[PDB]
Amino acid sequence: VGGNLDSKGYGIATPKGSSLGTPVNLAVLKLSEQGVLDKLKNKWWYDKGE
Amino acid sequence: IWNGMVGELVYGKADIAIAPLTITLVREEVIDFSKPFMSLGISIMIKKPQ
């Protein structure tokens, strides 16, 4: 019954100082470039309506 | 060839851009961005119905 209240999203979270933070962030950015994230969004949100 | 706000920034004609300049990934490759000071979104505008 209305528009969005703010502009915030979801981010992959890791423990502070973890070695996995930078590689996972790079993978997220590259997949955003590759469009796999939008493809999964289409598959699960738009491609599952009946 | 960049132009506009980013064009002035890249060629070093000015030091700081303080304007309604939206943070985008493509601009991040040539200029840096601060944290968002306000939230917004793209909307549609028409003349109100007579």
Neighbours of B22 (CB within 10 A): 11
Neighbours of A28 (CB within 10 A): 14
A19: contact with B, CB 8 A cutoff: no
| Residues 7-36 of chain B whose Cβ lies under 8 A from any Cβ of chain A | 25, 36
- Say what the resolution is, in angstroms: 4.8
Residues of A in contact with B25 (CB under 8 A): 32
Residues of A in contact with B36 (CB under 8 A): 7
Determination technique used: cryo-EM
Which value, in Å, is the radius of gyration of the alpha carbons in chain B?
15
How far is it, in rounded angstroms, from Cα B6 to Cα B28? 10
Place of tokens 């040539």: B30
